[PDB]
Design an enzyme around this catalytic site. Structure first.
Site, PDB file in Angstrom:
ATOM      1  N   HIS A   1      -7.502  -5.762   0.003  1.00 59.89           N
ATOM      2  CA  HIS A   1      -6.263  -5.005   0.166  1.00 59.89           C
ATOM      3  C   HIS A   1      -5.556  -5.393   1.459  1.00 59.89           C
ATOM      4  O   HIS A   1      -6.108  -5.241   2.555  1.00 59.89           O
ATOM      5  CB  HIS A   1      -6.602  -3.504   0.168  1.00 59.89           C
ATOM      6  CG  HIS A   1      -5.422  -2.587   0.043  1.00 59.89           C
ATOM      7  ND1 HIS A   1      -4.355  -2.841  -0.792  1.00 59.89           N
ATOM      8  CD2 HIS A   1      -5.169  -1.385   0.615  1.00 59.89           C
ATOM      9  CE1 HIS A   1      -3.491  -1.844  -0.719  1.00 59.89           C
ATOM     10  NE2 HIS A   1      -3.962  -0.947   0.128  1.00 59.89           N
TER      11      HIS A   1
ATOM     12  N   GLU B   1      -8.766  -5.633  -4.634  1.00 63.39           N
ATOM     13  CA  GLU B   1      -8.113  -4.478  -4.026  1.00 63.39           C
ATOM     14  C   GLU B   1      -9.129  -3.505  -3.442  1.00 63.39           C
ATOM     15  O   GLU B   1      -9.016  -3.102  -2.278  1.00 63.39           O
ATOM     16  CB  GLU B   1      -7.217  -3.784  -5.049  1.00 63.39           C
ATOM     17  CG  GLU B   1      -6.031  -4.634  -5.491  1.00 63.39           C
ATOM     18  CD  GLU B   1      -4.942  -4.755  -4.421  1.00 63.39           C
ATOM     19  OE1 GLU B   1      -5.154  -4.280  -3.284  1.00 63.39           O
ATOM     20  OE2 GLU B   1      -3.872  -5.333  -4.722  1.00 63.39           O
TER      21      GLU B   1
ATOM     22  N   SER C   1       0.865  -1.201   0.000  1.00 63.43           N
ATOM     23  CA  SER C   1       0.000   0.000   0.000  1.00 63.43           C
ATOM     24  C   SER C   1       0.894   1.242   0.000  1.00 63.43           C
ATOM     25  O   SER C   1       1.794   1.341  -0.853  1.00 63.43           O
ATOM     26  CB  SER C   1      -0.987  -0.096   1.150  1.00 63.43           C
ATOM     27  OG  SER C   1      -1.986   0.908   1.038  1.00 63.43           O
TER      28      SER C   1
HETATM   29  C1  LIG Z   1      -5.715  -3.367   5.195  1.00 70.86           C
HETATM   30  C2  LIG Z   1      -4.405  -2.623   4.909  1.00 70.86           C
HETATM   31  N1  LIG Z   1      -4.318  -1.259   5.256  1.00 70.86           N
HETATM   32  C3  LIG Z   1      -2.907  -0.763   5.288  1.00 70.86           C
HETATM   33  C4  LIG Z   1      -1.867  -1.704   5.832  1.00 70.86           C
HETATM   34  C5  LIG Z   1      -5.030  -0.953   6.495  1.00 70.86           C
HETATM   35  C6  LIG Z   1      -6.165   0.039   6.334  1.00 70.86           C
HETATM   36  N2  LIG Z   1      -5.776   1.315   5.752  1.00 70.86           N
HETATM   37  S1  LIG Z   1      -6.302   1.487   4.222  1.00 70.86           S
HETATM   38  O1  LIG Z   1      -5.600   0.575   3.365  1.00 70.86           O
HETATM   39  O2  LIG Z   1      -5.873   2.793   3.677  1.00 70.86           O
HETATM   40  C7  LIG Z   1      -8.108   1.405   4.152  1.00 70.86           C
HETATM   41  C8  LIG Z   1      -8.742   2.484   5.043  1.00 70.86           C
HETATM   42  C9  LIG Z   1      -8.901   3.821   4.577  1.00 70.86           C
HETATM   43  C10 LIG Z   1      -9.444   4.804   5.423  1.00 70.86           C
HETATM   44  C11 LIG Z   1      -9.820   4.453   6.747  1.00 70.86           C
HETATM   45  C12 LIG Z   1     -10.381   5.500   7.740  1.00 70.86           C
HETATM   46  F1  LIG Z   1      -9.816   5.252   8.924  1.00 70.86           F
HETATM   47  F2  LIG Z   1     -10.035   6.717   7.356  1.00 70.86           F
HETATM   48  F3  LIG Z   1     -11.702   5.448   7.862  1.00 70.86           F
HETATM   49  C13 LIG Z   1      -9.646   3.109   7.214  1.00 70.86           C
HETATM   50  C14 LIG Z   1      -9.110   2.136   6.370  1.00 70.86           C
END
Ligand SMILES: CCN(CC)CCNS(=O)(=O)Cc1ccc(C(F)(F)F)cc1
Ligand SMILES: CCN(CC)CCNS(=O)(=O)Cc1ccc(C(F)(F)F)cc1
Ligand SMILES: *[C@@H]1O[C@H](CO)[C@@H](O)[C@H](O)[C@H]1NC(C)=O
Ligand SMILES: *[C@@H]1O[C@H](CO)[C@@H](O)[C@H](O)[C@H]1NC(C)=O
EC number: 3.1.1.7
Lengths: 536, 532
Positions: free
Chosen positions: B437, B324, B200
């Protein structure tokens, strides 16, 4: 009369006719060829609505085909059978408003459903007397009464200065309507049922069938309709008033004629050939699958554009059969797109594909052209000469036939019409065009009319069974509004095209196979996205 | 006093700890400081090298995670908590971790550096899915992970200022890479065989080290999992970074120097409180403070640099998972949830496209809706649900990964591309989200080998296969076992044949074209559209 065949003398509203007793493979048929149905649209009547044919005295001889309407004649491949089969086969003349009638011999006992053929040829060409339109087989084998008319093509049929009285346009379509009025009055003298009349045509002929559906006066002259490889909607079948006018005054200037009365008057003093010789010079861009003089959106015959009219009209109690051949576009590439020919495998380059996209989609802006190029290219193999060639055929075929038919089938069906849709996939064993063209535009027709039944024509045995099968499909639909056999239940059934399931059948040597989706994804591109992109 | 756990680095002496991994011990050195704590007036500033220390510094524990937003939507749910911070939050967080076989390698061993993700807004290296013991114990690797500043603290930029010049989060990673160079040999690591790998925002960061010339002398191979430097979410223009910086400063009550001063005099949570309120549109897969195109770390835009760089002596491993986009729909898109099947209407699908593609014009979302609709079943709830997830997944990962792979392979690099198709048997997300993802990571780090994690036997075998692909990639640039003489081999991704492989339970299978027609739409045609 004395010693003639008493089954070949018939009276119609205009006078007496003597027909001919023709041999078909399986029996004799009655034919009445060359029946005049309008006054010769000649001299001061050129460009004008047909007047009904004044009655004649004595027995009119009706045993030869009459003159072909004056038209451009194809010179690309001289002597090649694949082109000559479409060229005129009787003298060219502005006096050409005649029709033909085949019937069982003796003429039938009960009143028989009538089939009316409207030939194609881009509104610039065609004749009801070509061999592929021979009704002797449909009459002998299926018992049908077949009627095919001549109608004016080219400048003489469709040159319009809209709003004027001396050239109001669409008069070629008015010829066809007059033949249809003729069938209503006269076809019972031959044993036809004037109350069971099915129109059917190919290319511009199919398109014309569409316009009779959409023009309210024609609607009481027929009851069912079959449109083969053609549509009233789409990019080639119609032109705006403005564009027709611009195309007419340009041709006037091109022959030396510069108030519309004085200009048309001058046009009426020119040899027919001088008009033919300049007809192709009035097209706005380098194009293929574009014809100079076609139906106009007049606010009369067509109350509005066909697109508007299919979107918003009521179509219950209307039964339609529609379909396409497999390679609608291939034929057109050799008349314009550099790189293509009938004598070459036509393996083109990426450069030539992009050049051809701008010719096959002439009205497209730079962006819309790119969009077409992006959709059709195979990004796993974007430079393969073979995929590019076949992609170029598919751009032209999709844009001009398959996606208009798809649009017509879905919009009619949504509006209450019983629709039946096919794709014709069998390539004649006797085709003289190269293999790369596949099943080209127009090579369904020899099978609907049943030429394979002629031993001398060297079709395969399966081809002859195949032709019998589609003859029964077409005639069953003319009789019942349903191509299926009532008796033949075990056979695979042909289901109606619905908006919900989009079913259609494949016509080839194997039994009917049902498919869902008339190039659905790719016609979403042409019918939905592309209008919105040149709307910006 | 175990001499295996005593190491002398250029900054002093450390004590590690001996941990049990399933098949043996490992030496772990957790919490090693690599920079001066970026607190107080050093906030938003480039990191400085850590001063030396007295005595033997205790490195047996994970240090604090960088100050970041913490997710709230499913409280105490394993699928989300597993990405949440597992130590205290602090701005004093610039520490790294090293795992090493016990005993320490007798020969210089290839080094693997891990750069976590979390949308440049979250993440840490102490998460259990980044546990380095398995790779060190089984493949015998030396594995390094660092913390880097995230959110406003890592990437808030008033470009061309000197108090907040942007990208300090990447300068954090960079300094860790230099620490590995100066020191890794002391642990048995081979400083001349260093492979970066991340996922990511981490995969994106790895890409930005490829594109920032000062980073190139600190590694030799790269792995970019489900993330890229190019594309819509990983960078901003200087104009746009400045916009959100001055917008956040307006929002917490705050000339460039005075503005950045006030921000320094503000409790951390006061900044994270307003973190999400500076996005220009309602979005998903969009983040408030990300790397900036500064004309420095990024000489030009990533799209411009991949379109033009020279990558001959470079070897790269790039890939995506099966679904994804699906993770992000529950975080903003009406109709989607982890707790029902998220079957949606056509109108709901139109509405989701304007948020999955927040930048797009009316005509361009039209174009996207027309492309992804299944015109055989245009109202089917399940096809629309799956298409919304594909729009989000393709626009943000699959198609950028396909554009970067194409540009790298074409311009001299050696590319190996995958698609990870196996869904964890332990996964706690609903069935419709597929393989979301970030759920290849547990298998690359070898977690199934932990028997208490209740993975299936084939999943253990599958994880060991993936560990070999990655470590073989690190040692050689080629993920293929140099011993396996069996036919299905992983072929290089090429522009001509466009080969990638699929990672799942069945043997390697080779496919051509990585969502080719659909990414031609995204990478070639849609740009022409908006800009007209
Ligand atoms: C599953 C792998 N990843 C990264 C390792 C974890 C979640 N971050 S993520 O990919 O960017 C998806 C996401 C975006 C926005 C929010 C919030 F907190 F803003 F609502 C939460 C989760
Ligand atoms: C193949 C059966 N069709 C339909 C009945 C007839 C041929 N004309 S066509 O379809 O409209 C294709 C065509 C376009 C232009 C030229 C010319 F004359 F301009 F070179 C010739 C042929
Ligand atoms: C085929 O012939 C046409 C016309 O003669 C020519 O322009 C074209 O380039 C030829 N193509 C091939 C592949 O031979
Ligand atoms: C049909 O085949 C015969 C040979 O059996 C040949 O002599 C004849 O000319 C052919 N006719 C056509 C129209 O191909």
């Amino acid at each position: 009369e004395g010693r003639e065949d008493p089954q070949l003398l018939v009276r119609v509203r205009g006078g007496q006719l003597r027909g001919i007793r023709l041999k078909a493979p399986g029996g004799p048929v009655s034919a009445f060829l060359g029946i005049p149905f309008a006054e010769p649209p000649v001299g001061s009547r050129r460009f004008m609505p047909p007047e009904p044919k004044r009655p004649w005295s004595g027995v009119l001889d009706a045993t030869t085909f009459q003159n072909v309407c004056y038209q451009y004649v194809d010179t690309l491949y001289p002597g090649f059978e694949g082109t000559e089969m479409w060229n005129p086969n009787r003298e060219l003349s502005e006096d050409c408003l005649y029709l033909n009638v085949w019937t069982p011999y003796p003429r039938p006992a009960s009143p028989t459903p009538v089939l009316i053929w409207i030939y194609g040829g881009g509104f610039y060409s065609g004749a009801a007397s070509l061999d592929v339109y021979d009704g002797r087989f449909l009459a002998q084998v299926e018992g049908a009464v077949l009627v095919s008319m001549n109608y004016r093509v080219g400048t003489f049929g469709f040159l319009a200065l809209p709003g004027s009285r001396e050239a109001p346009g669409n008069v070629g379509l008015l010829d066809q309507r007059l033949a249809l009025q003729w069938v209503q009055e006269n076809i019972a003298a031959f044993g036809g049922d004037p109350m069971s009349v099915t129109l059917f045509g190919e290319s511009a002929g199919a398109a014309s069938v569409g316009m009779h559906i959409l023009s309210l006066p024609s609607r009481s002259l027929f009851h069912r309709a079959v449109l083969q490889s053609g549509t009233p909607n789409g990019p080639w079948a119609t032109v705006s008033a403005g564009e027709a006018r611009r195309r007419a005054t340009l041709l006037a200037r091109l022959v030396g004629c510069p108030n519309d009365t004085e200009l048309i008057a001058c046009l009426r003093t020119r040899p027919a050939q001088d008009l033919v010789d300049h007809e192709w010079h009035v097209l706005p861009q380098e194009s293929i699958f574009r014809f100079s003089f076609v139906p106009v959106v007049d606010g009369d015959f067509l109350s509005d554009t066909p697109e508007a009219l299919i979107n918003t009209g009521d179509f219950q109690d209307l039964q339609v059969l529609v379909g396409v051949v497999k390679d609608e576009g291939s034929y057109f590439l050799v008349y314009g797109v550099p790189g293509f020919s009938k004598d070459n495998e036509s393996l083109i380059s990426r450069a030539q594909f992009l050049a051809g996209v701008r010719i096959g989609v002439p009205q497209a802006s730079d962006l819309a052209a790119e969009a077409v190029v992006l959709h059709y290219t195979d990004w796993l193999h974007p430079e393969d000469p073979t995929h590019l060639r076949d992609a170029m055929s598919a751009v032209v075929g999709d844009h001009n036939v398959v996606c208009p038919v798809a649009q017509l089938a879905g919009r009619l069906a949504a509006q209450g019409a019983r629709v039946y849709a096919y794709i014709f996939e069998h390539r004649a064993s006797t085709l003289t065009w190269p293999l790369w063209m596949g099943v080209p535009h127009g090579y369904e027709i020899e099978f609907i009319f049943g030429l394979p039944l002629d031993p001398s024509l060297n079709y395969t045995t399966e081809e002859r069974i195949f032709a019998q099968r589609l003859m029964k499909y077409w005639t069953n639909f003319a009789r019942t509004g349903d191509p299926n056999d009532p008796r033949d239940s075990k056979s695979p059934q042909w289901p109606p095209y619905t908006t919900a399931a989009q079913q259609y059948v494949s016509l080839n040597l194997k039994p009917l196979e049902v498919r869902r989706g008339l190039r659905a994804q790719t016609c979403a591109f042409w019918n939905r996205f592309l209008p919105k992109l040149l709307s910006a």
